[PDB]
Amino acid sequence: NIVELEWDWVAAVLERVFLIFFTICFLFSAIGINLYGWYIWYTENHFL
């Protein structure tokens, strides 16, 4: 049952790593695309 506990621990840590990795990927995707688009939109009217 100790072997089961050790593999439970590995899965618990791994899914915690997945939570952090997929949270940053979401933030950079949603924010990055819209911020880039706003930058293109802002330079058009204001300068060109």
Place this chain on the structure above:
Amino acid sequence: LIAPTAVITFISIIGFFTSSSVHDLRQEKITLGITTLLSMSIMIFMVSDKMPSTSTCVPLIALFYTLMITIISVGTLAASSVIFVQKLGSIGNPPASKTMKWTHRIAPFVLIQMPLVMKQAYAK
């Protein structure tokens, strides 16, 4: 077109990688992923009716939807690989050999701590 999709995608991510216990078998997240995936498809069809239907370019919003779909679909497979890793405890009793030192060092950085039962087993 963007705000409703981001909120659903963010909420579903938390559901993929959250559990109520450390030493219990996990439930499959396939149903959660399928329901989220099927809703975004309806959103895509609805938005697609407002556009020229050209093939020359890929809009900025198309890239946003592609990333949301990829995160949900790839996130569903990542959640299933967590169940795969936990299932290795039952199949034979080869314990983790070198993963256990790496797992212990990463454990404090990602704010997760060992359960009491695991600590008791180590002392035993």
Place this chain on the structure above:
Amino acid sequence: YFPRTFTNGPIGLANFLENDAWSVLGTKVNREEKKYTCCPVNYTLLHYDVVIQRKPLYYVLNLIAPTAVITFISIIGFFTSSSVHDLRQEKITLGITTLLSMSIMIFMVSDKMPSTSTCVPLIALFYTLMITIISVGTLAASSVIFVQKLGSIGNPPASKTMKWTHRIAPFVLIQMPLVMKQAYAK
């Protein structure tokens, strides 16, 4: 009637604006004399043909990609379990939800087509395979529950399946659990 053709062909394209969904492969013109029952003399007709080819990227992305991803994910859910020695949950609800979504997609796509009965399009064969895999996959998942239920109903153990099951076991990367090995030794 006689036709007057241009440098590039029967129909001029020097001022043509390209279409975002179609390509003009070429043009043709034919002059033919025809008799009709209403008149004793012939008529002269000019036939202009335009050959246009669709640009597929838009339709492949919007009609095929979303369905393939959902079908692939659902397949994994059908034949995946968290344990070997525990009763499985029925996958009928998973199959029904996937099946009902594909029906909506079929209705949505069907509104974009002539509604003819002459032919079966290429995309129709793609959808038929996706439906068959999900529907047949649902029955295959239920047959796994049927086989596991044979352990409780009486205790006739597997007779010749056990040697076949052990040889196939390594090729499909699955290994025996510890309890089964302990039971065998006991």
